[PDB]
Ligand binder design. Structure first.
Ligand SMILES: [Mg+2]
Ligand SMILES: [Mg+2]
Ligand SMILES: [Mg+2]
Ligand SMILES: [Mg+2]
Ligand SMILES: [Mg+2]
Ligand SMILES: [Mg+2]
Ligand SMILES: [Mg+2]
Ligand SMILES: [Mg+2]
Ligand SMILES: [Mg+2]
Ligand SMILES: [Mg+2]
Ligand SMILES: [Mg+2]
Ligand SMILES: [Mg+2]
Ligand SMILES: [Mg+2]
Ligand SMILES: [Mg+2]
Ligand SMILES: [Mg+2]
Ligand SMILES: [Mg+2]
Ligand SMILES: [Mg+2]
Ligand SMILES: [Mg+2]
Lengths: 100, 98, 81, 114, 104, 119
RNA sequence: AAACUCCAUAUAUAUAAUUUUAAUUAUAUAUAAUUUUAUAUUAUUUAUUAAUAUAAAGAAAGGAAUUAAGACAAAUCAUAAUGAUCCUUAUAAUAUGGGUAAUAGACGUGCUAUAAUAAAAUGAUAAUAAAAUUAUAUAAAAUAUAUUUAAUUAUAUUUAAUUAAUAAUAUAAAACAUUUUAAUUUUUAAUAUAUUUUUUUAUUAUAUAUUAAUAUGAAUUAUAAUCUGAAAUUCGAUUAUAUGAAA
């Protein structure tokens, strides 16, 4: 009726050898799909951006002549000093030498 | 098709009465003329309800039997037409040309 | 149901003291299977806040340690009417 | 011992919060320890190898810390840190996507009229 | 609230006509775990029976014996399936692999 | 009415469907069986059976764990879940879902079905 | 507010050497309508007037975006940012587990039923779509088992081709022929009929015995087993035999 199953299997073996493909008549769980999978690690890790982006700190080491200053940090410092003067603040953190 | 048209024209009421509770008790109903679509619907509902009272498991067979009966004048909704027409004849007085 | 061909779920837990001595095995590994080797050993399985003691029977084999340490206790409606 | 993670890593260049730091650490450590998990999984689920090798591979695979699990990487809003309704196309949460689209930041997005 | 079946008028068993009660019993053979057999009187219509778990295979009654296999009912419940389901692992390799945990 | 293993049947019925309908352990495939083994043609009406055929069906069904016995298997398994002190055991005892179903809004079923001694 | 605008409409023009073919297509530009007239009738600020009648000419008929000022101290300090405060060996950081999932009566919004104007099985020169996705993928054919010729559905084995008007996801499905389909003695057998033959008419059986409890429904359970994951116990989806409740 159909081609002999042995003939089909032989053709499969020959083609697999030629094209560098795994051959498995029995159908056992070889777990080759566990290995033949792409490494997504680089893309997953490069998700929140480049950590080496230039930051305001480096503008002193680069172009030391220009006297930059950041409104955000000045606002933070002003708020801290205002809290101190108004009487509020942050309690002194006890150093590591305390407690057992 | 001619038999069906005649059956619809003979079984569909010519008048009908709607509620007008804006006036006085009993809704002060006035008979109101109907169009061909409305008359056909009133006839068809009766035809279908009379055909569903038959035995055949197939709606086509039941409906054909009922239409044959109406064609030979053995319908069971002629009395419904008659009651509606008599009610219109009774309420003729309430008619008020708006 | 975990596929059989994968093999039973086994986690590193101390058994050598459990057999040589009578020391019970206190653990939070609720997802581990009860292998035939644990029968007769005393376990203390974490339920969320306290460790429940259980002795392993020959019938428990194949189940999970967490099936005998209920995490939530029964509901009781206080009608007060 | 003043760092919240076993291995020191850099800081994301933009919006930073504690959950973003956790997720970033998990991402990076998975990147450096993704080969080990794949190899160990193949060894531990391969029938042809000895059962002792399979057992030891499975035990070590289980003993691996959490910060090298592919299952614990979650997508977060790179502009807000919010981890609900995050579009992968822009790595932005729903509201940040809306405001950036209306503001013109996104490269080619526009309001939908059709 | 109690349920009881009614008492019928007891038939009078006269003085001297009261016979003893000899229920029907069979000389049944009872096989223990070992090859030993005991003849006994039983009212069940079963002349032959064998036991799987009994005195002859109990540690408490058999202290001197070195080896003593235990067994339970068969073809009932999910017994022994925890072993039948896993064929890759089979019996000393596991004993060696259970050497130590190295945890502290 | 015809009788097989003391169950009243109807002559209009088909054996292949009626066996599954009115036996605890019979269904599609196991009812195609029995019929196939005894040679009854696929759509016999059970009013066409001879007495030898009736007793052959009776014997074949008696050669299976069909009714009562299967109920015993299920009851024994539930009883074992209770005996071993399993979560599923107390769900069965308390008449609550045992396959991880939310109980907050609707568990109307298994309140009247789950129990230690199930049908 | 209307227009302007986007998706749609028609026409043209331009690109494609029609083997990225869908030229019956794709998308760049322009035109068109927020439609014109002609006689009719009521009318009426008289004709310069509308509402209709509808000969005519036109392809021409939709959709969504846009929802002002003021307010309801409406919701949002849990998208993020913030003033005052309030925690600083905690109210700030990590991991193992357990919470969010519990269940007496309530209440929303949905899914699936309760049969014959309606639900299953088959339809290989494979009846007929649109819009999307695929480098943090995709899975054609083929071969194995559940299950025996197949096929169909579930899993594995290999992975072809394509980072894509080309491969793939993917032979849309309902319709439409056919078979069946309990309540239904409205049926099925046995013989006889004969010009209804896939069929009807006889005489017998199909009668615990005509107004609801299946060959509808698939909730609830038992047991194999399989996906994904380090890992489904508390808690994930799957086929298989059994279970077959309420309606
Ligand atoms: Mg901040
Ligand atoms: Mg995730
Ligand atoms: Mg049944
Ligand atoms: Mg506008
Ligand atoms: Mg407004
Ligand atoms: Mg509020
Ligand atoms: Mg905040
Ligand atoms: Mg919730
Ligand atoms: Mg809603
Ligand atoms: Mg139906
Ligand atoms: Mg259905
Ligand atoms: Mg088709
Ligand atoms: Mg298309
Ligand atoms: Mg295929
Ligand atoms: Mg169909
Ligand atoms: Mg059904
Ligand atoms: Mg279901
Ligand atoms: Mg369900």
């Amino acid at each position: 009726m159909n081609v002999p199953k042995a003939r089909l299997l032989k053709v499969a073996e020959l083609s697999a050898k030629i094209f560098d493909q795994n051959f498995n008549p029995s159908g056992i769980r070889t777990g080759s799909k566990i290995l033949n999978e792409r490494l997504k690690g680089p893309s997953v890790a490069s998700y929140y951006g480049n950590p080496d982006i230039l930051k305001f700190r480096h503008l002193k080491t680069l172009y030391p002549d220009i006297e930059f200053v950041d409104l955000e940090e000045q606002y933070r410092l002003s708020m801290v000093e205002a809290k101190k003067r108004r009487g509020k603040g942050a309690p002194k953190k006890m150093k590591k030498d305390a407690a057992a | 098709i001619q038999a069906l048209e005649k059956s619809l024209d003979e079984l569909a009421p010519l008048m009908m009465t709607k509620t007008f509770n804006t006036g006085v008790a009993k809704a002060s109903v006035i008979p109101v003329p109907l169009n061909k679509r409305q008359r056909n619907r009133i006839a068809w509902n009766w035809i279908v309800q009379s055909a569903n009272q038959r035995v055949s498991s197939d709606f086509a067979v039941r409906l054909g039997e009922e239409l044959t009966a109406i064609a030979k004048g053995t319908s069971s909704a002629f009395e419904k037409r008659d009651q509606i027409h008599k009610t219109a004849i009774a309420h003729r007085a309430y008619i008020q040309l708006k | 149901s975990r596929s059989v061909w994968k093999g039973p779920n086994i986690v590193p837990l101390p058994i050598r003291e459990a057999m040589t001595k009578g020391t019970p095995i206190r653990t939070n590994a609720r997802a581990a299977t009860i292998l035939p080797q644990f029968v007769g050993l005393k376990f203390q399985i974490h339920n969320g806040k306290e460790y429940v003691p259980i002795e392993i029977s020959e019938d428990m084999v194949g189940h999970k340690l967490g099936e005998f340490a209920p995490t939530r206790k029964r509901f009781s409606y206080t009608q007060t009417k | 011992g003043n760092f919240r993670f076993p291995i020191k890593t850099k800081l994301p260049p933009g919006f930073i919060n504690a959950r973003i730091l956790r997720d970033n650490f998990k991402r990076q450590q998975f990147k450096e320890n993704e080969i080990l998990v794949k190899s160990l999984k193949f060894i531990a689920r391969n029938m042809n190898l000895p059962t002792k090798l399979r057992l030891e591979a499975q035990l070590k695979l289980n003993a691996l810390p959490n910060y090298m699990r592919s299952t614990q990487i979650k997508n977060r809003c790179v502009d807000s840190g919010h981890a609900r309704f995050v579009l992968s196309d822009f790595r932005l949460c729903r509201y940040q996507f809306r405001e950036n689209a209306l503001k013109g930041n996104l490269p080619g997005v526009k309001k939908g009229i059709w | 609230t109690r349920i009881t079946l009614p008492r019928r008028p007891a038939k009078k068993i006269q003085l001297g006509k009261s016979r003893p009660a000899i229920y029907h019993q069979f000389n049944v053979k009872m096989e223990l775990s070992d090859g030993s057999v005991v003849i006994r009187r039983s009212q069940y219509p079963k002349g032959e029976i064998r036991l799987i778990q009994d005195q002859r295979n109990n540690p408490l009654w058999n202290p001197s014996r070195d080896d003593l296999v235990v067994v339970d009912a068969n073809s009932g419940g999910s017994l022994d399936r925890f072993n039948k389901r896993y064929s890759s692992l089979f019996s000393t390799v596991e004993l060696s692999e259970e050497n130590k945990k190295k945890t502290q | 009415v015809v009788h097989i293993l003391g169950k009243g049947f109807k002559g209009k019925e088909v054996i292949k469907i009626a066996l599954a309908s009115k036996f605890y352990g019979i269904g599609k495939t196991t009812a195609e069986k029995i019929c196939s083994k005894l040679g009854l043609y696929p759509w016999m009406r059970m009013h066409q059976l001879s007495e030898p055929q009736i007793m052959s069906i009776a014997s074949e069904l008696s050669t299976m764990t069909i009714e009562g016995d299967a109920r015993a298997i299920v009851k024994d398994n539930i009883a074992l879940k209770r005996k071993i002190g399993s979560y599923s055991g107390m769900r069965h005892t308390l008449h609550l879902p045992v396959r991880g179903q939310h109980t907050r809004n609707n568990a109307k079923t298994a309140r009247k079905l789950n129990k230690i001694d199930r049908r």
